[PDB]
Structure formats: C-alpha cells, structure tokens
Design a binder for this molecule. Structure first.
Ligand code: 9Z9
Ligand code: WB9
Ligand code: CA
Length: 1206
C-alpha cells in the first residue's frame, strides 16, 4: 500500500540518482559478505586468528553500509523482499551494539546467513525460477497435509504400543558394571516377554537410557513423531524394527512397519511425482504454445542447409581451378577409406591410454610412448587435410570438429611441454576425445551428448538456486553447529561443520541421506543432550532433507519431462468337452493353487521331521495329477508353450525320485497362474521390447564406467599405497613392528606389525577401478577429498542418462495407453433425494445432527481426544494416567451420544447405509468394549480410538479427491502388481532353499531377525533389499564358507548370492518404476486439469443444490426454479453476481424445450443446457447438428429419449 506521500523532492531522488550504479554496489557487497561468512573459521572455545577478528572488523563496515542504505531508502518511502533487508539490519546492528559492550551471538549472529537471500532478491535472473518453484508447490499442499496425517497417526499408534519397552539391555556379567553387550546394546527382554533372551552370564535389567542415546524410542510423543519420520524416509527402518522386535517379541511388531513404509513412502512418493509431473506438462504445453520445438527443427534444417551448400561452395572452386589437392581431399573425406581407417586408429589409440598400469615395465611403458608419438601425428595430418576439403568455416562450425581441433592442440601442448606428471596425465585425460570420436552407437551416443548439452543448458538457473541454497545452509551449519562437535572421541566424524568445505560435505551427505540421521544426533547431542532445547537443532536437519530434496527433485524432473520428450519427439470330442468345462480348468487352477503352497511351505532346516518329511508325498500326488495332465496331453497338441512348461515341471517333479538343485528348480509352478491374468486379455512383444530397452541402457552405463575409470588410472595410479605406521612414508621403511594404543589409551600398548598396503578402490589398473565404480553403485584427506568428487560424477552422469534413455524411452507406453465426459454426466445422470424426517421428534434431532455446527463440534472433540492420547510419556504421574483414562471415558461417552442421536435422526438403515457412518459405529463399539475391559488383545481394542482421526480426512475436497482418485486407480495396476508379488514369491522359495541353512550368528547379518528359514522371514528380508536397506551386506553374508546351522547338521551358503541379490534388486526396481509410471499415466487426467474450465467435480455441485431444493427421489421440477436456476451457480459454470433476473431467463427459454408438460422436465435439461452454455456454442439449424452429434458420438448413439434439446 504505497503511502504516495510525494513530498516535493529530497524524498527519494537519492537512490533514484544512479539507480544501476547504486544497485550493483549493494549486490557486490552481498557477494563480498557471502565470501566473508565462509572464512571465519568457527572454533573450539574462543580462540581466534588475526583474520577472524579482522572479519568482525569488516562486519562493522557491512553494518554501516547496510544501515545508510536502509535509512536512505526509508526516507524515500518509509512490501515483501525488502522486509528481509529490514529484519537483517535490525537484528544486525542490534546484535552487535548489544554485544558491543558485552565483551553468545551464535543465534543472534546466525541470521546474517540470510543476507545471501538478497542475491536472489536483487538479481531477477533466478527470482523467476523461485516463483516457478513456489507456484509449483501450491498443488502439492494436500500431500503435505497427508504426509503429516500419516506421521501423526503412526506416532500416536506407536507410543501406545511400544513406548517405554525399550529400556532394558543385557546389563552385566553377573558382576557389577554397565551394558556389556559388546557395544551395540539392543533392547533385551526379561525371561518373560518373548523378546530377546539374554545368554551367557549376562542379565537383563532396567536402565539403558535408550536404544541409541534415547533418540530412537517411542517413549514420549515427540521422540515418537520424529522416529516415525526418520523411519518413513527409508533411512534405517529395518533398525528401528529390529530394536522393537527385540523388546516385545517378533509376532506383531512388523505389521506396523511394513505398512508405515508401503502406505508411507511408496504411496506418498507417487503422489508428489504425479503432482509434479502434471505441473511440468502444463508448462511444457505453454512452451509448445510458444512454438519453440518447431523453431528448433527449423534451426536444424538451417544447419543441414549450411552443410548442403557448404559442399556447394566446396564445388564452387571446381569451375575455378591447389585445385587438384582440393578435389583429392574432398574425395577422401567422402571416401570411407579415411573413415574406417581413422576409426581404427581411434580404438588402437584408445588402447594405448588404457595400457597404463602401475608397476608397469618398459615392455608397457616403452610401447605406450612409442604408440602415442605416432598416433598423435596421425590425427593431426588427418584433421589438417580435412580442413581444406571442408569449408574452413563450417568445419570449425560443427561442435564436434571444433572440439577435435581443440584436443589436437592439447597434444601439441603436451609435446612442447615434454620438450608435471599430474598435468601431463590431465592432458592425456583430455585426449580421450578420440576415444569417443568414433561416436560408437551414435544413435544414442550423439543424442545423449547433444541432449546432454541441451539438458545442462536448460536447467542452468535451477542449478544456480540449488547452489545458493546449499551455500546458505552450509554457512548456517558452521554457525549453528560449528565448533559444537567436540564430543571428546578420537572417533573421526566424516560429517562435521568444522569448516565450509566440510560444511558443504555434511550438507550433501544429509541431502543424500548417507548418514543424515546420524548427523542430526551430532547436533541434537551437541548443543545439549536429548532434552528439550537440545532438539530444536533437529528442526534444522529436516528443513534440509525436505527442502533440499524437493528442489533436487524439481531440478531432475525438468531434465526428463521437459527435455527428453522435446528431444525424442470321438475321443478327442469328449476330451475337449471335459477339458473345456470348469473342472478341467478352474479346478486345475486350484490343484496348483494350493499345490504351490507345497514349495512355499516346507522345512528347509531340520532334516525330516514329519513336517518336512511327509510333504514329499503330496508332491508325489500333485504329480500323479500332472500325469493326468497327460490325459489332456495329446488331446490335441501338434498358448501351449505354457503347456511345455507344464510338461517340464511335471517331468522334473517325477525326476524328484533321486536328485537337490532340480528340486529347488520347481518354483516355475507359481508362474502357471500369471499367464491366466494376462489371459485376462487386453503385450508379450511389448514386454520383450521393454527388456531389450533395459539391456541396451545397461550398456551405456557400462561403457561410461569404462572411460571414466580409464581416466582414473591416468590420474590416481600409485597414490593410495600406504603403511600401517603413519610415521613411515616409504615401502622400505615399513618393515617390522610398531605400537598402537587401543582407543588412544597411553596405557594400552599393542605391538602390531607394519605393512605396506594399497587402500580400497585400488586404481592400480583399469580393472579395479572398473569394479570400484560398480562398488560405489553397489584415506581421510591424503588425496581422498579429490577422489571424493570423482565418486560423485560417475553418479551424475550415470543417472543423467540412465534416466534420459529410459523414462523418455517409456513415453511410447503413453502413446500406447472432457466435453464428451461432461455431456455424459449431463446425459445418463439421475437426480438424487435426501432423507427427510417423517416424525417431529425424528426431525428436531435431524436438524441438529445435520446442523452444520454439530459437525463443527464433532471435529473439535476429535481433535481433543487425539490431543489427549498424544501426551503419554514414559514416566507419567499416576494421577496423570487416571486423568487420561477418565478423559477417554468422557470422550467415548460423547461419541455414544452422537451415534444414538444420529440413529434417531436417520433411521437405522439410513445411518448404516453410509460407509463413514458404519466406520464410526465400529470405532464406537470397540472403544466401549475397551472401556469395559479397562474398568475391569486388549491393546488392539485400544488403538481404535486413534483411528477416528482419519475421519478428519474425509473433509477437504482437495485431499478427498486426490486419494480417492489414486485409490480408484490402485486396481488398474494389476499386471504390475501380480507381477511383483510373483517376484517376491519365486525369489523367496528359491532363496529359502539355497541360502537357507546358513547358520544364524547375531554378530553377522543373517541374524535371527533377518534369516532365511521361514517363508515369512525371507519375504521380510527381500522387502528390506527392495526398500534399499543395506542389501549389500546381506549379500556378502550369503557367500560360500558360512557354517551350517546346528539343526541343519562350512559347507553352506552357495555363491549364487551375487546373481540373486543383484538380479533381485534390478528386477525389483524395474517392476516398481513400471508401477509408478503405470499409476500416474493411467490417472493423467486429474493430474493435469484446467480447473477453470468445466469438469465433472465442478458439476456434482448441481446435484447437491438441486436435491437440496427437492423433496424425494424426483425430477420434474416446478417452474419456481426461477430462483434456484442461478440461485447458487459456481461462477466457472454460470454467472456469479450478474443480475439473475436478466436474459438469463429469456435465453434459458430461448432454446426450444422438450415437448413435455408444464412441470414434466427432468434435471438433465437444465444441467445439459447449462453445460452447453458453459461449452461449445451453436445456433439454430445446428440444433439438429447438435442432436445428431449427441446420438452419434457421445457413447456413440447411446439411445436416449432426449426429446428436443438436452
Ligand atoms: C495419459 O497419458 C498422457 C501422457 C503424459 C506423459 O507423461 C509424462 C509425464 C512424466 C512422466 C510420467 C513421463 C515419463 C516417465 C515418468 C518418470 C519415471 C521416473 O521415475 C522416477 C521415480 C523416482 C525417481 C527416483 C526416479 O524417477 C520419477 C522422478 C520419474 C517419473 C515418474 C516422472 C514422471 C514421468 C512422461 C502422454 O500420453 C501420450
Ligand atoms: C489388459 O491387457 C494388458 C495391457 C497392458 Br498395457 C498390460 C501392461 N504391460 C506390462 C507392463 O510391463 C511389461 C514389460 C515388462 C514386464 C516384466 C518387467 C518390467 C517389464 C518386464 C520388462 C521385465 C503389458 C506388456 O506390455 C505393455 C505393459 C498388461 C495387460 O494384461 C495382459
Ligand atoms: Ca540408506
């Protein structure tokens, strides 16, 4: 609200003078402070260098410039973004002057990290990106109102069952001390609770603050909400589960987590993608509206024009003939002789480069040098000759040719240099150009590189914003937690806000979630213990994992949806009788249905306890059953390739007579039902096509990992070798023994032996680098920091194109996959009634129960109950528990009132005729039974209460619709769901049979809580791997050499492991992306709709208004509609304030009405007429055009007695 106090002059006319010069110096000051907050090293205690104090000095210049600017601009006016300036200044000068005499800014001076926001504010280049980002999150606020609901429901349920049970721990050795359990202490359970039982001479006893310093316990509510949150982010969900499993037994803890994950992450994860993608498409559409794609095609056609007449200017000297040389080189460049030859020289040169390996003899070193020397001469002559034939200009024009020239110059440079080793290696890394000069598989290579340039160029500004955000947080990190990480442990923390470099690293790790929850603890245990004010440090490590990851996802998607696409665009008779009748069909479906359970249910540990034992006979019998499947065999043999798999499984089943591997090779039975579902008809080739696409994509990554690492060899060879004794720095020096003090105990000398060892990720040869590169997918700073960044790029590049080729590849799936729908909701739609009270008493209550207020009150009471179950700590004064129980009684009683009232405002059937009403009924009865039991399992009848909260979700249209929609599409994902369960099942039986008897050792990863001995536990282990939870280690635990279990009676743990787990991870990821894509695509109408124009949801309102003015199940409205016709019409539909008594009536009578009586016209007439006015318009004569159009097209000519219009 501009004051417009235009007091003549000298108000403004100061910053008005030299706008651009004065604006810039402020921006330069901002950039100087962004580089001033990144020096001050934050320190232990109060020590300071000269610079720090000297930067506090220049903060007294940045706090005289920002104040004169502020006041001079105030004089002008005295809005939004400028508020940031004002608050930063206020807090600033303040803080200082306050502290001026004080000589604990921290917080008070941890605000200046908000100054780099003025970098966004001033520069308008990314300010638009910030509005786009902000304006894209507006739709997905319903999803932020639901992630919160799931968390709350889960936290509440959780504190109720598992709170306070995690406090024991094997606490001794029948002597006197502390948790002995190695280190890892894990809730233990007394000899009566079926939890872990403690062994040896250990004893369980109360104490142990917690599972993990007390911050991973459902004790108390806040710890509970936070635990659930850390838990849904799939960052150690298995661990919380194991601690809980240890404390309360293993039977029911798991259901609660599997759900939390499936309903919390997979389901919730999809919505954000669906909401975000729909938004991108809207933007993509606006962009298409621009016509840019067509313009880009015209630019490429211009490019081929300059080439196609570049050959013409080349020929221009043919009539001007020196000339001979020109003609020769022209033929050459065209002559394949040059092409194939040069391609060959590439690979061979490529070879030379890879040849380099540590400890290389001259046999190699000599050869490499000799080759390069000549190979380099080769490329030169060729490029040089290609210069003349081609048009110098156009030759330099083609990006690739230009890069070629650049790198040949690199060779010249390195040669004249030889006339540091690192620099030479770098130049040779540059020479990997030719390596890809051949443009192998350019079909993709070219597109990916071209796209890569386009893609990277496209998201420049978004990347800028990401970087600004990261820098801001890192500065806050060093200010907030910097210096507070001295926990007095020689333990080396990779994550520490000691300095900005590390600060950035910590932030990135948190963003990547490598150990982000762990980093939380550092701060939340730094500033203070796991107490009250010591947790307001966590409110930070989240704001970074949601916001950062949000921006990160926004930036990615863009790559995809917004580029890839733009870029990519007698006896036999009777036999049939029986074998066609249900019996020899739906019945057989059963004979395998439960037969499949045979492999699913088996004892794969103990030898032949009846259990395992007898199960052989059933196999035998199902197999005689498959012989019977021979009576059906020649019935009509030579959809039967399925029948050959029946033949094979049947034969190996009879082959079970005396055989092992074959036995375990019987899981094909499960797949005998999968065919039946695709047989629900509705492609095999498409599947094959998808598989081919996937394989192809594997190869791109593979070759990249090759070239990237051939870079590593040249750069890191021989710089990881080291000795155990840090003092020694030469292989020769490292010979003998040294002394190590356990945990830095001066009184704990340990005579270890010195050894010269190469570190992990040994780039000693292309090969090891190769596998390490896989290892990242599957010292501290000696030279590590550098390697670090190398181990971040393979990533970027990898994803960058693994996605590019794939998601863009997919869309064809979408190719395969409003006015009409609105017509069909106007036609083929019937009006509804509403229960009216037939009795006076039945009525008063009705008015009330339906009185809006009553609903208002109900919700208030609901909030209160949950605010009464939330407060349940670990140690609550008994008075308090009594209070809580009495309160629950009051609440249950109040809900009884409503149930009974409603049943007296709506007849029994009416109340019960509504799902929500029945839900309420159930909650109430169960809650009352709980009350009874208490006044007197029990716990189950208690959780109930909490659930009610859900009914608060059956409210806002925004949230109601989204869920309903996706739920209304979580059935059209069958084929990508049966497929997934099939996977789990098969892999599990297989697994339980090979990696099964591996003995269980709590110290390893095949512990009693993640074993492979009962179908259920194996499916849980596979779900962990799928959820990407350290699947790796489980895998290592399944390699040969593990001892066989005692009941099994080291011949165990077959090597197949790698194939299994890796194959599993891969297949799972795919099937899952297929799931998400399937869902969203199928529901891609809601995910993108111009709510402005008319849709169905904008149309149902008419029924709820019409029935409001309509007694029974009726139609045939009275003429007194003259009021309601526009009484309450959504302005998108009709008018909103315009005089109702306008032509509105004359026009509604203007079109002909159906030849009915005075009051025998349906609601369909008014509805469809309003829709028509709301949609495409037509004139007279077109009356019949419209009529025939309706009864020829919209659901074809669905016969309708639509007499006259509408
Ligand atoms: C009705 O049909 C309309 C259809 C609309 C076109 O749909 C586009 C919308 C984006 C969409 C659905 C498309 C392709 C792959 C989809 C992606 C797979 C990736 O998977 C993820 C999962 C999570 C990430 C870790 C990796 O990538 C998502 C980010 C990514 C994803 C789900 C984002 C959405 C993408 C194309 C056109 O029809 C011809
Ligand atoms: C109703 O008819 C149907 C229509 C469609 Br579309 C589908 C879905 N399908 C299956 C989706 O994935 C099939 C491709 C493969 C299935 C196995 C995994 C992941 C991927 C496969 C590559 C490894 C049918 C096959 O091609 C199109 C996609 C199933 C139907 O049921 C037969
Ligand atoms: Ca992880």
């Amino acid at each position: 609200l501009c004051l417009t106090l235009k007091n003549p002059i000298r108000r403004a006319c100061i910053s008005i003078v030299e706008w651009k010069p004065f604006e810039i110096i402020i921006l330069l000051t901002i950039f100087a402070n962004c580089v001033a907050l990144a020096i001050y090293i934050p320190f232990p205690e109060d020590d300071s260098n000269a610079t720090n104090s000297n930067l506090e000095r220049v903060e007294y210049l940045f706090l005289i410039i920002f104040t004169v600017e502020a006041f001079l601009k105030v004089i002008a006016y005295g809005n939004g973004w400028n508020l940031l300036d004002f608050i930063i200044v206020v807090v600033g000068l303040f803080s200082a002057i306050l502290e001026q005499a004080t000589k604990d800014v921290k917080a008070l001076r941890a605000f200046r990290v908000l100054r780099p926001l003025r970098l966004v504010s001033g520069v308008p280049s990314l300010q638009v990106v910030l509005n786009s980002i902000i304006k894209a999150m507006v739709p997905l606020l319903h999803i932020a109102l639901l992630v919160l609901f799931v968390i709350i429901i889960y936290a509440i349920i959780g504190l109720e069952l598992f709170m306070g049970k995690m406090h024991k721990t094997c606490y001794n050795q029948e002597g006197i001390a502390d948790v002995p359990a190695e280190d890892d202490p894990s809730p233990c359970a007394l000899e009566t609770g079926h939890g872990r039982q403690c062994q040896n001479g250990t004893v369980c006893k109360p104490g142990w603050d917690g599972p993990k310093h007390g911050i991973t316990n459902f004790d108390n509510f806040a710890f509970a909400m936070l635990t659930v949150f850390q838990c849904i982010t799939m960052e150690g969900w298995t661990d919380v589960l194991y601690w809980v499993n240890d404390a309360v037994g293993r039977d029911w803890p798991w259901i609660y987590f599997v759900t939390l994950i499936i309903i919390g992450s997979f389901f919730v994860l999809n919505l954000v993608l669906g909401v975000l993608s729909g938004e991108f498409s809207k933007e993509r559409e606006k962009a298409k509206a621009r016509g840019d794609f067509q313009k880009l095609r015209e630019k490429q056609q211009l490019e081929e024009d300059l080439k196609g007449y570049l050959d013409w200017i080349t020929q221009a000297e043919d009539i001007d003939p020196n000339r001979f040389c020109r003609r020769k080189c022209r033929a050459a460049v065209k002559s394949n002789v040059f092409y194939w030859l040069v391609i060959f020289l590439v690979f061979l040169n490529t070879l030379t480069i890879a040849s380099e390996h540590y400890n290389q003899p001259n046999w190699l070193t000599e050869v490499q040098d000799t080759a390069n020397k000549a190979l380099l001469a080769l490329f030169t002559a060729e490029m040089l000759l290609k210069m003349y034939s081609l048009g110098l200009q156009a030759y330099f024009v083609s990006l690739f040719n230009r890069f070629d020239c650049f790198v040949v110059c690199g060779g010249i440079l390195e040669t004249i240099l030889v006339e540091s080793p690192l620099g030479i290696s770098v130049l040779r890394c540059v020479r990997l150009l030719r390596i890809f000069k051949i443009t192998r598989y350019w079909n993709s290579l070219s597109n990916l590189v071209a796209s890569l340039l386009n893609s990277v160029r496209s998201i420049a500004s978004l990347l800028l914003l990401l970087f600004l955000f990261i820098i801001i947080f890192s500065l806050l990190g060093m200010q907030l937690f910097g210096g507070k990480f001295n926990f007095d442990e020689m333990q080396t923390r990779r994550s520490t806000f000691d300095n900005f470099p590390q600060s950035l690293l910590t932030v990135f790790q948190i963003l990547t979630g490598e150990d982000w929850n762990s980093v939380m603890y550092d701060g939340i245990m730094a500033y203070g213990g796991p107490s009250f004010p010591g947790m307001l440090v966590c409110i930070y490590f989240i704001i970074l994992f949601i916001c950062g990851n949000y921006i990160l996802l926004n930036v990615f998607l863009a790559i995809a949806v917004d580029n890839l696409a733009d870029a990519e665009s007698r006896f036999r008779l009777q036999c049939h009788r029986i074998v066609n009748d249900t019996i020899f069909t739906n019945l057989i479906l059963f004979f395998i249905l439960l037969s499949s359970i045979s492999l699913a249910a088996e004892d794969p540990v103990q030898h032949t306890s009846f259990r395992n034992h007898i199960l052989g006979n059933a196999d035998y019998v199902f197999t005689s059953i498959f012989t019977l499947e021979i009576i059906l065999k020649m019935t009509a043999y030579g959809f039967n390739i399925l029948d050959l798999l029946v033949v094979s499984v049947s034969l190996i089943s009879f082959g079970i007579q005396s055989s092992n591997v074959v036995k375990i090779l019987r899981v094909l039975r499960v797949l005998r039902p999968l065919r039946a579902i695709n047989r629900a008809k509705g492609v095999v080739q498409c599947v094959f096509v998808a598989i081919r696409t996937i394989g192809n994509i594997v190869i791109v990554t593979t070759l990249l990992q090759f070239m990237f690492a051939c870079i590593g060899v040249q750069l890191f060879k021989g710089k990881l070798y080291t000795c155990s004794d840090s003092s020694k720095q030469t292989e020769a020096e490292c010979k003998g023994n040294y002394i190590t003090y356990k945990d830095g105990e001066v009184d704990h000398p340990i005579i270890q032996p010195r050894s010269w060892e190469n570190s992990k990720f040994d780039f000693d040869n292309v090969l090891a680098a190769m596998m390490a590169l896989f290892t990242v997918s599957t010292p501290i700073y000696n030279y590590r920091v550098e390697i670090s960044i190398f181990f971040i790029i393979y990533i970027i590049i990898i994803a960058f194109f693994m996605m590019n080729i794939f998601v863009g590849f997919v869309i064809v799936t979408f190719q395969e996959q409003n006015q009409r729908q609105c017509v069909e909701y106007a036609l083929k739609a019937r009006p509804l009634r509403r229960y009216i009270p037939k009795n006076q008493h039945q009525y008063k209550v009705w008015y009330v129960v339906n009185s809006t207020y009553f609903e208002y009150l109900m919700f208030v009471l609901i909030l209160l109950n949950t605010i009464c179950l939330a407060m349940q700590h670990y140690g609550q004064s008994c008075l308090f528990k009594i209070a809580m129980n009495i309160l629950n009684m009051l609440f249950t009683g109040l809900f009884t009132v409503e149930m009974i009232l409603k049943l007296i405002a709506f007849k029994p059937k009416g109340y019960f005729s509504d799902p929500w009403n029945v839900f309420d009924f159930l909650i109430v009865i169960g809650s009352i039974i709980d009350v009874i039991l208490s006044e007197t399992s029990i716990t189950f009848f208690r959780l109930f209460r909490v659930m009610r909260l859900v009914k608060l979700l059956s409210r806002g249209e925004g949230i109601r619709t989204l869920l309903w929609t996706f739920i209304k599409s979580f059935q059209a994902l069958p084929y990508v769901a049966l497929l997934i369960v099939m996977l789990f099942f098969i892999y599990a039986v297989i697994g339980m049979q090979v990696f099964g008897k591996i003995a269980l050792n709590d110290t390893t990863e095949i512990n009693r809580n993640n074993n492979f001995q009962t179908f259920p536990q194996a499916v849980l282990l596979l779900f962990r791997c799928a959820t990407g939870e350290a699947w790796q280690d489980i895998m290592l635990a399944c390699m040969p050499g593990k001892k066989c279990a005692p009941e099994s009676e080291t011949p165990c743990g077959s090597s197949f492991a790698v194939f299994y787990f890796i194959s599993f991870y891969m297949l799972c990821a795919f099937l899952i992306i297929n799931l998400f894509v399937a869902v969203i695509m199928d529901n891609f109408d809601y995910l993108t709709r111009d709510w402005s124009i008319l849709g169905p949801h904008h149309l149902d309102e008419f029924k709820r208004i019409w029935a409001e003015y309509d007694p029974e199940a009726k139609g045939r409205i009275k003429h007194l509609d003259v009021v309601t016709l526009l009484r309450r019409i959504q302005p998108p539909l009709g008018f909103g304030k315009l005089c109702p008594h306008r032509v509105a009536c004359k026009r509604l009578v203007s079109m002909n009405m159906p030849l009915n009586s005075d009051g025998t016209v349906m609601f369909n007439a008014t509805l469809f007429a309003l829709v028509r006015t709301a949609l495409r318009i037509k004139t007279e004569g077109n009356l019949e055009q419209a009529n025939e159009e309706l009864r020829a097209i919209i659901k074809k000519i669905w016969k309708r007695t639509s007499m006259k219009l509408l």
